[PDB]
Structure 1
Amino acid sequence: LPPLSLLDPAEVKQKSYSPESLEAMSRLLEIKLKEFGVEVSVDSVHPGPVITRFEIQPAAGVKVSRISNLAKDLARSLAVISVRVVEVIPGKTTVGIEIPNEDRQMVRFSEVLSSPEYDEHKSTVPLALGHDIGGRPIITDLAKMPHLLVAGTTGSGKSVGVNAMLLSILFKSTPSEARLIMIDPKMLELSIYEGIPHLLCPVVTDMKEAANALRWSVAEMERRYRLMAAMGVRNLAGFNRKVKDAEEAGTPLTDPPPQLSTLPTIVVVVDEFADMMMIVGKKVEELIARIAQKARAAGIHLILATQRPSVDVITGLIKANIPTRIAFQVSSKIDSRTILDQGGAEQLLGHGDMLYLPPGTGLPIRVHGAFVSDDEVHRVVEAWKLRGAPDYIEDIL
């Protein structure tokens, strides 16, 4: 396992505004809202990486619609670019004005790995995404996720997000914990990971070979179901406890008479499945739901990314089988509601700053990404290709 040292360090940026730069801002906000029909008091300020909150508490009889209908004029009042309005803080009575900083601050990925939350996260599939609105890192478990969608326009950063999630996978698990299968119809960027001791097939060329490896994923799911129905327990990690935590004393624990190894995690990462669903038809569309309907205890998790998120490629046949979604900067509230049912993803800044709904419900989370360089990736790839070997399960195609 290679260390954290190959990334760029946590630099120093003094662009974090002065307390006067927020205080005069806050008094100017109170003056400008007092010039309209509303009346409000700034209760707290939270600075941020790019956008910046304002905990404001309206006095009495001041409905939030009288802020959300002043929004654009308030934005031109403070001479900033635009303002989204927080409808509710969870647990706290105040509404929030989100104002983006002009000099936005890029968040390096080693800053995301710098938390004690990452390295002392008990799971084997962390998904380090980046610092939130307030600046705290939010890293969530893929095993409890259980699946992800990624959508955004061209250039909006989906390659960077997928590289961030994959390097989140790489730094924590051994080869015998979490294998992965990569599929890329846009045959250009995800070939960079070829050579690691984690990656089952070679990183594929066409869907013509990759659909058969996805049927192999189906058969691996059936192997997993047969062996967990036989040996008794339900979760994958429950069974992987059950094997070694029975064979403290040395035994292979023969099973339905071959041996028993550990039970690794499988992660299907797909670059652009819109191409695959278009150029095949509905067979692969059936395969995706057939995976994602029987997966959470199977230890096969699905990462998808597209470019058009419309219902031509993501039907209701998938839409209830992948709860957790991420959308990057998109072009329409149509597509916004389509892959983020709350809607609001058309107001993104670009270059990361995605929406995210947790494994709760109905409440999107705006968390910035991590600008991961390709050379950081190349260092990590060299560090794995020295610390390992070309391990493969062939005849997967």
Structure 2
Amino acid sequence: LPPLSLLDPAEVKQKSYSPESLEAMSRLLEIKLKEFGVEVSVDSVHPGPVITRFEIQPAAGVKVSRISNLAKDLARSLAVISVRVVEVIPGKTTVGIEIPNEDRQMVRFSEVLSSPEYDEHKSTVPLALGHDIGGRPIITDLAKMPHLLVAGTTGSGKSVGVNAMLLSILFKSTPSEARLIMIDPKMLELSIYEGIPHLLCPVVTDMKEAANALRWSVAEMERRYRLMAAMGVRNLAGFNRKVKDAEEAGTPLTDPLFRRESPDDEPPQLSTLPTIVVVVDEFADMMMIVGKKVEELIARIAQKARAAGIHLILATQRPSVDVITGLIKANIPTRIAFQVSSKIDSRTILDQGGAEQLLGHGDMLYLPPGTGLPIRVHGAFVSDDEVHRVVEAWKLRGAPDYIEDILA
């Protein structure tokens, strides 16, 4: 299993904003808001790697909308590219304003995977997103999402974030614990992972083949459910316990779904199944080339795949109603949104405005399932070298075990 040593080190964090600096900006904020309609006062300051949040306490009678409404102008008066108004801060009666730091200090992938949360993570498919507005590492579980929709226009840092996602898997799981199906409608982005042992087939470039890989996944999903039913198990996890225990008890289990066709035929022995992850780099391109069936397959996978251990990672730079459709969205409750062109775009992916206010370069809004405000996360940066490195590391540890069956 490749060492975190392959990752570039955390660059000198030349941070720290003198108590005086922060206090100065605080008064400035107050002044500027005062110059416009609202009278408010800073309640507390929380600096971070990319932005600094100023929780302000609105004067009597002032409505939050008034603050949100002049985020464009406030930003200008402060000479910052944009400012993010967080209308509600749980438990407090304050509102928050996140202003971009003059010097954004970078977040290195190694700086995230080094956390104990990622280290002690028990999932086969953990996703280290980056740091929250306060510098703390945000580690998630793809298997609990249990599918992911990713959107971001060019320049937002979406591609890097996807690499961060893939590397999160590759730094924690072996091919027998997690397998991948990579669809790259543009022989660009994912082609750099060709050959790693986790791949179930080559990086899919032909869209017709990609459609088959999706069909294959539905079948593999159905087969697993059939298997688990016979085993008296509820999901891949339980299936794997059953099979492991059996092996630790010298009495290995045998495929219950085996059908004898000859007196010779012998039931093959069961082995642990890997968590399957299907990532489509630009699913709007797959939809465009192939048609309505891509959407239908996605919906079918996403509505039932969880318990079987098959998970979807769908990314696009075209967050429109035509691409992120009702069918696609239906059972993919978890959304990550990097910077997008407009509130409209933001709503398409997050069903809520905001992503348009992101700063680019990995700044994102992570929205897990259920009510709850999206979590702002400053994506970790991972270079093509760090990726190229981890790939070679894995190519050494094993050759590509393809199932040509899948793409046909």
Query: Is the shorter-chain TM-score for this pair beyond 0.5, marking a shared fold?
Result: yes
Per-residue deviation, 1:289: 0.8
How has the CA–CA distance of structure 1 residues 209 and 66 changed in structure 2, closer, same or farther, with 3 Å as cutoff? closer
Q: Tell me, in whole angstroms, the C-alpha distance in 1 between the residues paired with 2:172 and 2:275.
A: 13
1:11 partner SS: coil
Q: Percent identity over the alignment?
A: 100
How has the CA–CA distance of structure 1 residues 371 and 329 changed in structure 2, closer, same or farther, with 3 Å as cutoff? same
How has the CA–CA distance of structure 1 residues 269 and 70 changed in structure 2, closer, same or farther, with 3 Å as cutoff? closer
Once the two structures are superposed, residues 219-268 of structure 1 have per-residue CA deviations (whole angstroms, 9 ceiling, x without a partner) of: 10111011011111212112212221343212221199221100210000
How has the CA–CA distance of structure 1 residues 65 and 275 changed in structure 2, closer, same or farther, with 3 Å as cutoff? closer
Once the two structures are superposed, residues 117-141 of structure 1 have per-residue CA deviations (whole angstroms, 9 ceiling, x without a partner) of: 1010111110011001111111110
**8 Å Cα contact 2:109-2:381 kept in structure 1:** yes
1:335 partner SS: helix
**8 Å Cα contact 2:336-2:365 kept in structure 1:** yes
Once the two structures are superposed, residues 12-32 of structure 1 have per-residue CA deviations (whole angstroms, 9 ceiling, x without a partner) of: 132432221101111232344
Once the two structures are superposed, residues 297-350 of structure 1 have per-residue CA deviations (whole angstroms, 9 ceiling, x without a partner) of: 111000011221212223211211111111222112222111111112112211
Q: Tell me, in whole angstroms, the C-alpha distance in 1 between the residues paired with 2:73 and 2:359.
A: 19
- Corresponding pairs, count: 397
**8 Å Cα contact 1:156-1:352 kept in structure 2:** yes
1:297 partner SS: helix
**8 Å Cα contact 1:278-1:313 kept in structure 2:** no
2:48 partner SS: coil
Per-residue deviation, 1:78: 3.4
Q: Tell me, in whole angstroms, the C-alpha distance in 2 between the residues paired with 1:278 and 1:79.
A: 41
How has the CA–CA distance of structure 1 residues 2 and 19 changed in structure 2, closer, same or farther, with 3 Å as cutoff? same
1:197-346 alignment runs, 5 A limit: 197-254=197-254, 257-346=267-356
Segment drifting more, 244-253 vs 174-183: 244-253
**8 Å Cα contact 1:53-1:98 kept in structure 2:** yes
Structure 1 gap segments, 5+ residues each:
none
**8 Å Cα contact 1:342-1:363 kept in structure 2:** no
- 2:166 matched residue in structure 1: 166
Segment drifting more, 360-369 vs 94-103: 360-369
**8 Å Cα contact 1:227-1:256 kept in structure 2:** no
Per-residue deviation, 1:354: 1.2
With normalisation by structure 2, the TM-score equals: 0.92
How has the CA–CA distance of structure 1 residues 244 and 43 changed in structure 2, closer, same or farther, with 3 Å as cutoff? same
Once the two structures are superposed, residues 148-194 of structure 1 have per-residue CA deviations (whole angstroms, 9 ceiling, x without a partner) of: 11112123222211111000000001221111111111012211111
How has the CA–CA distance of structure 1 residues 281 and 351 changed in structure 2, closer, same or farther, with 3 Å as cutoff? same
How has the CA–CA distance of structure 1 residues 194 and 259 changed in structure 2, closer, same or farther, with 3 Å as cutoff? same
Once the two structures are superposed, residues 261-298 of structure 1 have per-residue CA deviations (whole angstroms, 9 ceiling, x without a partner) of: 00210000111121111111112221111111111111
CA RMSD of aligned residues (A): 1.9
How has the CA–CA distance of structure 1 residues 267 and 83 changed in structure 2, closer, same or farther, with 3 Å as cutoff? same
Q: Tell me, in whole angstroms, the C-alpha distance in 2 between the residues paired with 1:33 and 1:394.
A: 63
Per-residue deviation, 1:82: 2.9
**8 Å Cα contact 1:161-1:370 kept in structure 2:** yes
Segment drifting more, 30-39 vs 154-163: 30-39
How has the CA–CA distance of structure 1 residues 211 and 97 changed in structure 2, closer, same or farther, with 3 Å as cutoff? same
2:271 partner SS: coil
1:246 partner SS: helix
Q: Tell me, in whole angstroms, the C-alpha distance in 1 between the residues paired with 2:117 and 2:372.
A: 25
Per-residue deviation, 1:356: 1.3
Once the two structures are superposed, residues 20-55 of structure 1 have per-residue CA deviations (whole angstroms, 9 ceiling, x without a partner) of: 110111123234444555443322211111111012
With normalisation by structure 1, the TM-score equals: 0.95
